[PDB]
């Protein structure tokens, strides 16, 4: 279930970048500034995983979740119309501001992200693509006495429809059980906290596919974060056994208790 957008209602503007089986553009709806996620020419199983994401995102509402306006489906074209968030992806921003992002700023982002994921967990919904690229900055929190404001974006094509090579490319955000899950987002959240702590440089992100697969096969563990208040929590989320990961209710409480 999602809103159908007619092709006449959307205008495509400049290219923002590439996603998994997609090209992202700034656009106009009706006029409202939006983002257009244009799926590549695809088989039906890929387009169905794109529809499942649009349906998931159309049935949720949370202050830290990005809005989905609908989907344009006509012949070979599939375009998801999503919320344009003022300052774009968190990973890109963190890399530009490297060395100048305070610890307190990172803690706020962590709590907002846990609140969005606690909301999804309570509705028994899995995101499957938690990473810095999918976290959007609505407010920067740069001025004295202000705080950042993030929105978790849609997960794009569902993990279940991707190739093994594409899953390997998602290491370290990919939960290890997904390599060959109501707990996969806890691992994705933990790897995103490391990515945030390291100013947008996630561990392993540069390693070759075979090096990434060996790390998981041997159950080597990711580094401790540079934020000392997040070390216990990241270690608990980044456990190979899925049943040992804490719930987002616990994660969100553990963050408020710091």
Q: Which residues bind ligand 3SM (CB under 6 A)?
A: 16-19, 24, 35, 82, 84-85, 88-89, 92, 136, 153
Nearest approach in angstroms of CB 91 to ligand 3SM is 9
Nearest residue to 130 (alpha-carbon basis) of 148, 116, 149, 147: 116
Q: Could you check whether the bond before residue 10 is cis, i.e. omega within 30 degrees of 0?
A: no
- Nearest approach, Cβ of 151 to ligand 3SM (angstroms)? 8
Question: In whole angstroms, how close is the CB of 195 to ligand 3SM at the nearest point?
Answer: 15
Discontinuities in the chain with C to N beyond 2.5 Å fall right after 30, 180
**Closer residue to ligand 3SM (CB): 25 or 215:** 25
Least Å distance, CB 240 to ligand 3SM, is: 30
- Judged by CB, which is closer to ligand 3SM: 80, or 191? 80
82 vs 192, which CB is nearer to ligand 3SM? Answer: 82
Least distance between ligand 3SM and beta carbon 85 (Å): 4
Minimum Å distance from CB 95 to ligand 3SM? 9
Please identify which residue in the block is written with the tokens 């190739």.
Answer: 163
Query: Rounded distance, CA 28 to CA 35, Å?
Result: 8
Q: Which of 129, 223, 254, 227 is nearest to 185 (CA)?
A: 129
Our CB check for ligand 3SM shows the closer of 16 and 108 to be: 16
Nearer to ligand 3SM, 18 or 217 (CB): 18
* Residue whose beta carbon is closest to ligand 3SM: 17
User: CB-wise, 125 or 140, nearer to ligand 3SM?
Assistant: 140
Q: β-strands 32-39, 68-74: how paired?
A: unpaired
């Amino acid at each position: 279930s999602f809103h159908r957008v007619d092709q006449k209602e959307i205008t495509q503007l400049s290219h923002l970048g590439q996603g998994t089986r997609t090209n992202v553009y700034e656009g106009r709806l009706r006029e409202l500034r939006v983002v257009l996620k244009v799926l590549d020419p695809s088989h039906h199983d890929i387009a169905l995983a794109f529809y499942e994401t649009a349906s998931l995102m159309s049935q949720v509402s949370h202050t830290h979740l990005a809005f989905v306006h609908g989907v344009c489906v006509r012949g070979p074209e599939n375009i998801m119309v999503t919320e344009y968030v003022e300052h774009g992806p968190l990973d890109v921003w963190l890399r530009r501001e490297r060395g100048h992002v305070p610890m307190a700023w990172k803690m706020v982002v962590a709590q907002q992200l846990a609140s969005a994921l606690s909301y999804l967990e309570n509705k028994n919904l899995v995101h499957g693509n938690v990473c810095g690229r999918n976290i959007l900055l609505a407010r920067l929190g740069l001025a004295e006495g202000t705080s950042p404001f993030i929105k978790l974006s849609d997960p794009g094509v569902g993990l279940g429809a991707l190739s093994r090579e594409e899953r390997v490319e998602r290491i370290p955000w990919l939960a290890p059980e997904c390599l060959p899950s109501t707990a996969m987002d806890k691992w994705g959240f933990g790897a995103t906290l490391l990515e945030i702590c390291f100013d947008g440089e996630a561990p392993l992100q540069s390693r070759s596919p075979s090096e990434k697969e060996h790390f998981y096969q041997r159950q080597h563990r990711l580094p401790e974060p540079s934020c000392p208040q997040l070390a216990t929590l990241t270690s608990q989320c980044l456990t190979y056994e899925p049943t040992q990961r804490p719930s987002f209710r616990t994660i969100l409480r553990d963050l408020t208790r710091l």
